[PDB]
Amino acid sequence: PNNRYSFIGGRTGQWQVVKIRNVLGPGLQLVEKVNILNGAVAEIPLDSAWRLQGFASNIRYAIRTELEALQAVQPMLNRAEAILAVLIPIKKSAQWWEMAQDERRDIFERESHHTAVGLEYLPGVARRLLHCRDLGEEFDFLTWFEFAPEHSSAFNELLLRMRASKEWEYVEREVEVWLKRL
Amino acid sequence: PNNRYSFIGGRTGQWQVVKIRNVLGPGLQLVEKVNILNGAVAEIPLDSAWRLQGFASNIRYAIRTELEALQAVQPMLNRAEAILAVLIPIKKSAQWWEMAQDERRDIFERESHHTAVGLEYLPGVARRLLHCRDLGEEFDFLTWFEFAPEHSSAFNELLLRMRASKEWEYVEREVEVWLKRL
Ligand code: HEM
Ligand code: HEM
Numbered sequence A, B: 001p002n003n004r005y006s007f008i009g010g011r012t013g014q015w016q017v018v019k020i021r022n023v024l025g026p027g028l029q030l031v032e033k034v035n036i037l038n039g040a041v042a043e044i045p046l047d048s049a050w051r052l053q054g055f056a057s058n059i060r061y062a063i064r065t066e067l068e069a070l071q072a073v074q075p076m077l078n079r080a081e082a083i084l085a086v087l088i089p090i091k092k093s094a095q096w097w098e099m100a101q102d103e104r105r106d107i108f109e110r111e112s113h114h115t116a117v118g119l120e121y122l123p124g125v126a127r128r129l130l131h132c133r134d135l136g137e138e139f140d141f142l143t144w145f146e147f148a149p150e151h152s153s154a155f156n157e158l159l160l161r162m163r164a165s166k167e168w169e170y171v172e173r174e175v176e177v178w179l180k181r182l
């Protein structure tokens, strides 16, 4: 039961890179494939362009009644139908991290409705949130979404809605890595 | 600016071990000294007995008005007179970590008054909170306190008040390493 996940862009992996969109700030080099490994990488293989890593952690903002709503409808990863995925690494500004817990919760849910908006796109979209600021990585979060092609248009709508939120005014680096399951 | 810290119990270090208290659950081996290093150490040196590590992280529970109170009084580390120190690794239960953010905040402060009680022992006591559950370590937190002998009795009071709090019903492993600055 290891909470560390690595994402290595390169020639090998379980996922074909469809495209990479460098939304904001320095991007990620285009590669053929992404290899996802659970655990800490011993040595990065040859012909790898980049390595991202993060860990699964405890809830930081969601309250019990939100967790109950998410749990009632959120799908599992690895659904046979979920052949599309998107890896989105995200970095938030130093202004964000300086803020107190009540100030960040108010932006996250009261002003931006992150959980309420996201719930609109379940059960179509499965997700996994990983943290990596505390590892000294270049991003603060590795977010992961997977879904069937039927939900691609919906997911693209969700992305536009989130980037218009107050919360995203604190995002200062973002890349979309679009993937297809091999 | 590396946020990782390592505490190596052994025969070298900047701190002499006065005593080790095996408060709850498996203890830590008694050693002569503790060595504190900033950064991640990959090879523990020979005739060291244990290594603890954690990182400095963002605020998880404190609200803005509590941060302002803490900042008004909390003392710096490495005060000339702060020749005593206590390193207290703590592990919380699986039931704690499964709880939602509002549930944990209400136990932490509304019921246990962690911050309000701690502020009573400032500015005598300087402190540093490190996290390590997300590193896969045996403990969840490494807490560090340092003060002059004048505040030894006050700090021992604080410990007894905290161990009787609702929050401590979720602690399942705890060790006190009492130190003296060399
Ligand atoms: C698909 C529906 C989604 C749902 C149901 C959802 C739900 C959530 C929840 C409940 C959290 C808080 C976890 C906690 O309390 O620690 C969270 C965090 C986060 N989500 Fe989402 N989310 C969705 C989509 C997205 C998308 C599309 C993105 C990025 C484009 C995203 C980026 C993030 C980030 C960066 C965080 C961490 C926030 C922080 O800790 O500051 N989420 N999400
Ligand atoms: C000396 C006065 C103290 C003050 C002013 C104080 C203040 C605080 C504050 C404000 C936090 C929350 C940090 C955040 O929001 O992320 C915290 C966390 C914590 N403190 Fe203290 N504290 C004190 C003493 C102690 C003592 C003596 C112990 C152990 C015996 C302790 C154990 C912890 C633990 C384990 C956490 C992490 C709680 C969690 O995230 O679940 N504290 N402290």
Ligand SMILES: O=N[O-]
Residues within 6 Å of the ligand: A127, A128, A129, A130, A143, A144
């Ligand atoms: O909900 N962001 O993984």
Ligand SMILES: O=N[O-]
Residues within 6 Å of the ligand: B127, B128, B129, B130, B142, B143, B144
């Ligand atoms: O307040 N725990 O360092």
